[PDB]
Design a protein around this ligand. Structure first.
Ligand SMILES: CC(=O)N[C@@H]1[C@@H](O)[C@H](O)[C@@H](CO)S[C@@H]1OP(=O)(O)OP(=O)(O)OC[C@H]1O[C@@H](n2ccc(=O)[nH]c2=O)[C@H](O)[C@@H]1O
Length: 698
C-alpha cells in the first residue's frame, strides 16, 4: 500500500510531465502491488481517457467507485469520459452524482457547467461556473470558461477587470509551463500580447507531441521529387468539416477545380458522413477521399497518409471541434500548411506554412506566427457563393409607392417571370448592369399580400413565387445551400420588422464578436443617423437584453436595434440584400459572415486590428477593390458608416461597386483562387525539392 502509494505518486508526476506511457506502466504496477487501490484505478482511467482508450478508462473508473462508492472525483472524471463518447445523459448522471456526494466539489460543478454550455444552456453554465469559483476562487479553467460564457451573451459586467484577470492568469500559467486556460481559438477575443496568443497555441501543439510519443513512430521518409506520382503534387486536405460546416461552404469547389495534369487531391475527412451534398461533392470530386473517422488510432491514420504519398498536407482545423493535430505532429509529409479553417497560428513547429495574404498578415507581424507566411496574391479567403447561391447573382424589386433593398425577388427563372409581365422598368445601375423594377400593379399587390399573410407561396403567370421565410417548407436542401432554389423567392424588410424608410446597418455574426468599444462605435453611428436601425441576430437570443441595455445606457433610444432569429444558410445570405451597410466587428471580423454579406451586394465597413481574425474583412474588401470601406481608426469607421447612411448617392455608388465587383473581382472566383493556390503550392514544393527550409513567400 505505500510501495503502491509511491508508484501512484511517481505516475501522477510522470503524467503531469507528459510521460503518458511511463505513467500507465506505474499505475498498473501500483494495482499489481495493491489491487483495491481506488485512486490508482481512477488515475489509470484518466490517463487511458487522455490516450483515447475510453472503454478501458470507463472500466477502471467503475472499479474505483466499486472500491470507494463515495469517490466523487471518479464520478466527475467518468462523466468527462462519457461526454467524449457522446453519452450526454451518462455524463450528466455522473456529474450530478459527484455533486450529490460532495456539493463542495468545484471541479464537478465546472464539468457540469461545461455540459450546460455545450447544450446551449448558457445561463445554467454561468450559474455552475460561479458555484465552482465560489468553492475554489483560484480556478483558472472555470474563470476563463466563465469569461467565454459571458462573452457569448455580451455580459460586460466589470469587463476591463475581467480582461485584466484573463491576461494575468495566462501570464502566470505561461511562467509555470501549465496548459493555459484560454483556448487558442478564443485568444483573439482578449487583450493578450501576440507572444501570449502564439504561446497559448505552442502549448496545444506540445500536448499533441506528448500523446503520439507512446506510439514511438520513426520519422517518416518523404519523397523528394514527383517521379512516383507521374509529375503531380499529391495534396492532402485534412478537415473535420467536410459536410454542412462553414469550411465546406467556403472551399467545397476547390478539390474538383485542381488541375489533374499537375495535382492529385486527397481529402482526409476526420468526421463521419453527415448525409449532406457538401460531403457528397467533395467525395465525388476529390481524386481520393479517405474517411479517417473510421481510423481512430492516429498512428494507423498518419500511416494511411504516408502510403498515399502526400507532398503537401493541409490542416484546415486548427484547435477546433474534432481536430486531430496528432496526425500532423507525426509529420507524415514534408510540407504541412495551415489553410482557411483556423483564423490563427497553430503555434506548432510541425506546421511549416500558414496560407494567408499581405492584408491579413503583413510581414511586420510575421513573428505573431510560428509558421512561415505563404501569401496568396489577393486574399487567402474564398467563398463557394457563386456555386451555392447563383440565384443571388441578379435581383429585381417591386416599387411599393426607387429602392434596391425593400422588396426583392431572386430566381434562376426571374428573367422569364419579368418578361411575362406588362410594363417592367429597367434601372441602369451606378456601377464602375441593371435592376428590373416591377411597378405597383395587380401582380405587385398579390406578392405583398402573400408576405403580409405569412402564406408559403403563390403562382403568377405559371411561375412559382415563394415566401423567403418558408424555404425549409418548400425545399429544405435549398434552405441549407445544398441545392440551388428552383422557385422565385421574395425577400422584404417587412418580413424582418425592418423600417421601409430608414437606413439598415446589419451585423450577422455570433454576438461574442461584439465588445463594449464596438457597441459604443455602433451607437455613435446610429445617433448621427436619425431613423437608422442596427439589425443583429439572436445568436444567441439570451444575448439580446444585454446588448439592448448597454445601448440604452449609451443614450441610444429603444427600438434602434432590431433582432432577427438565426436563419437557414440561404435565407441568411439572401436577406443581407435588405441591409444598406454591414458594420463589421473589429475585435473578430466576419470571415464566412463577411463573404455572405458581400455576396448580397452589401458594403461592409471594417477596422482591421492586430490579429489575423481582426484583419480578414479588410483583406476581403481589398480583393473586392473597396479600399474606401477600410477604416484606420474608430472615428474613420464611424465617419465612413455615417457617410454611407446619409450621402445616399455615395451609398448607391458604393453598393453598385460591391454588386459588380463580387463578380468582376477575384473574391468569389473559385477557379482563379484554385490556380493561385496551385502556383503557391508548386513554389512550396520547389523550395523543398531543392532541399531548402520553409521560408516566407512574397
Ligand atoms: C472566429 C471564427 O470562427 N472564424 C471562422 C473563419 O475564419 C473560418 O475560416 C470559417 C470556416 O472554416 S468559420 C468562421 O467564419 P465566421 O464569420 O466567424 O462564421 P461562424 O464561424 O461564426 O459561423 C456562422 C455560420 O452561420 C451561418 N449563418 C449565420 C447567420 C444566420 O442567420 N444563418 C447562418 O446560416 C454563416 O453563413 C456561417 O456559415
Amino acid at each position: 500500500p505505500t510501495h503502491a502509494d509511491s508508484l501512484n505518486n511517481l505516475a501522477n508526476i510522470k503524467r503531469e510531465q507528459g510521460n503518458i506511457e511511463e505513467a500507465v506502466r506505474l499505475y498498473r504496477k501500483a494495482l499489481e502491488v495493491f489491487p483495491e487501490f481506488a485512486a490508482a484505478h481512477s488515475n489509470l482511467a484518466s490517463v487511458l481517457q487522455q490516450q483515447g482508450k475510453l472503454q478501458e478508462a470507463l472500466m477502471h473508473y467503475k472499479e474505483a467507485i466499486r472500491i470507494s462508492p463515495t469517490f466523487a472525483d471518479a464520478y466527475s472524471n467518468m462523466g468527462n469520459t462519457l461526454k467524449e463518447m457522446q453519452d450526454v445523459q451518462g455524463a450528466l448522471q455522473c456529474y450530478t452524482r459527484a455533486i450529490q456526494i460532495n456539493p463542495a466539489f468545484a471541479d464537478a460543478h465546472s464539468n457540469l457547467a461545461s455540459i450546460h454550455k455545450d447544450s446551449g444552456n448558457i445561463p445554467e453554465a454561468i450559474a455552475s461556473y460561479r458555484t465552482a469559483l465560489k468553492l475554489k476562487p483560484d480556478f483558472p479553467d472555470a474563470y476563463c470558461n466563465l469569461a467565454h460564457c459571458l462573452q457569448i451573451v455580451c455580459d460586460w459586467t466589470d469587463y476591463d477587470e475581467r480582461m485584466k484577470k484573463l491576461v494575468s492568469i495566462v501570464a502566470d500559467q505561461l511562467e509555470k509551463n501549465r496548459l493555459p486556460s484560454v483556448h487558442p481559438h478564443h485568444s483573439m477575443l482578449y487583450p493578450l500580447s501576440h507572444g501570449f496568443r502564439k504561446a497559448i497555441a505552442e502549448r496545444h501543439g506540445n500536448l499533441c507531441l506528448d500523446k503520439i510519443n507512446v506510439l514511438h513512430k520513426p520519422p517518416y521518409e518523404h519523397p523528394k521529387d514527383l517521379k512516383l506520382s507521374d509529375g503531380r503534387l499529391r495534396v492532402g486536405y485534412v478537415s473535420s468539416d467536410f459536410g454542412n460546416h462553414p469550411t465546406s461552404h467556403l472551399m467545397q469547389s476547390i478539390p474538383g477545380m485542381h488541375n489533374p495534369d499537375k495535382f492529385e487531391v486527397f481529402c482526409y475527412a476526420l468526421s463521419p458522413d453527415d448525409g449532406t451534398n457538401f460531403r457528397v461533392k467533395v467525395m465525388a470530386e476529390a481524386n481520393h477521399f479517405i474517411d479517417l473517422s473510421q481510423i481512430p488510432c492516429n498512428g494507423k491514420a498518419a500511416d494511411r497518409i504516408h502510403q498515399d504519398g502526400i507532398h503537401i498536407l493541409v490542416n484546415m482545423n486548427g484547435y477546433t471541434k474534432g481536430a486531430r493535430y496528432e496526425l500532423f505532429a507525426l509529420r507524415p509529409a514534408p510540407i504541412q500548411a495551415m489553410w482557411l479553417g483556423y483564423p490563427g497560428t497553430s503555434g506548432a513547429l510541425f506546421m511549416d506554412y500558414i496560407i494567408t495574404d499581405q492584408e491579413t498578415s503583413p510581414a511586420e507581424v510575421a513573428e505573431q506566427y510560428s509558421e512561415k507566411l505563404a501569401y496568396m496574391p489577393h486574399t487567402f479567403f474564398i467563398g463557394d457563393h457563386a456555386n451555392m447561391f447563383p440565384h443571388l447573382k441578379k435581383k429585381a424589386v417591386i416599387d411599393f409607392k426607387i429602392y434596391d433593398n425593400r422588396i426583392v425577388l431572386n430566381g434562376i427563372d426571374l428573367k422569364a417571370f419579368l418578361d411575362s409581365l406588362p410594363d417592367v422598368k429597367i434601372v441602369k445601375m451606378k456601377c464602375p448592369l441593371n435592376m428590373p423594377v416591377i411597378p405597383m400593379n395587380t401582380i405587385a399587390e398579390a406578392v405583398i399580400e402573400m408576405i403580409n399573410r405569412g402564406q408559403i407561396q403563390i403562382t403568377i403567370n405559371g411561375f412559382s413565387i415563394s415566401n423567403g421565410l418558408a424555404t425549409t417548407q418548400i425545399n429544405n436542401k435549398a434552405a441549407t445551400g445544398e441545392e440551388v432554389p428552383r422557385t422565385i423567392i421574395v425577400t422584404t424588410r417587412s418580413q424582418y420588422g425592418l423600417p421601409e424608410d430608414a437606413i439598415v446597418y446589419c451585423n450577422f455574426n455570433q454576438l461574442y464578436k461584439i465588445d463594449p468599444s464596438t457597441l459604443q462605435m455602433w451607437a455613435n453611428i446610429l445617433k448621427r443617423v436619425p431613423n437608422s436601425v442596427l439589425w443583429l441576430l439572436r445568436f444567441p437570443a439570451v444575448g439580446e437584453p444585454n446588448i439592448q441595455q448597454y445601448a440604452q445606457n449609451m443614450g441610444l433610444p429603444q427600438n434602434r436595434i432590431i433582432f432577427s432569429p438565426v436563419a437557414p444558410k440561404e435565407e441568411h445570405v439572401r436577406r443581407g440584400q435588405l441591409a444598406d451597410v454591414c458594420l463589421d466587428t473589429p475585435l473578430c471580423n466576419g470571415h464566412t459572415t463577411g463573404m455572405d454579406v458581400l455576396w448580397a451586394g452589401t458594403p461592409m465597413v471594417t477596422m482591421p486590428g492586430e490579429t489575423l481574425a481582426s484583419r480578414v474583412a479588410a483583406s476581403q474588401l481589398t480583393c473586392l477593390g473597396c479600399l474606401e470601406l477600410i477604416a484606420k481608426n474608430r472615428q474613420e469607421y464611424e465617419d465612413i458608416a455615417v457617410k454611407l447612411g446619409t450621402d445616399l448617392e455615395y451609398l448607391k455608388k458604393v453598393r453598385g461597386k460591391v454588386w459588380k465587383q463580387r463578380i468582376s473581382s477575384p473574391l468569389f472566383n473559385t477557379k482563379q483562387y484554385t490556380m493561385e493556390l496551385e502556383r503557391l503550392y508548386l513554389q512550396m514544393w520547389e523550395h523543398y525539392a531543392a532541399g531548402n527550409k520553409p521560408d516566407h513567400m512574397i
